[PDB]
Design a protein around this nucleic acid. Sequence first.
DNA 1: TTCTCTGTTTTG
DNA 2: CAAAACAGAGAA
Length: 89
Amino acid sequence: RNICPIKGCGKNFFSHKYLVQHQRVHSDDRPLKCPWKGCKMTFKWAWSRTEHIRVHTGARPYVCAEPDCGQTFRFVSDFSRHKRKTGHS
DNA sequence: TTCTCTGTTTTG
DNA sequence: CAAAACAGAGAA
Ligand SMILES: [Zn+2]
Ligand SMILES: [Zn+2]
Ligand SMILES: [Zn+2]
């Protein structure tokens, strides 16, 4: 199997490629930058970025497809917890 | 709660 | 295939 060599997280990963990508966890480097003017937030992960951006735009893209629901959510986490505790879609 | 992290799945 | 998106975990 695929295992992180860093003593302290001997975590196991489905792929080797993601074993490489995983290493950013252990660096303090934060390559990805917020694109919003004068915001100094940084990330290691694009998905963090993507979602962070909607705090600036206030967008609420996740829209419940279930009839007589129609709540919306900014982040995926909220939508997944939601259908978990409702069973919609 | 609101928001970020991260491992795996899905997408194009 | 890799980039995007998911799902649920983790911070605050
Ligand atoms: Zn590790
Ligand atoms: Zn920002
Ligand atoms: Zn719903």
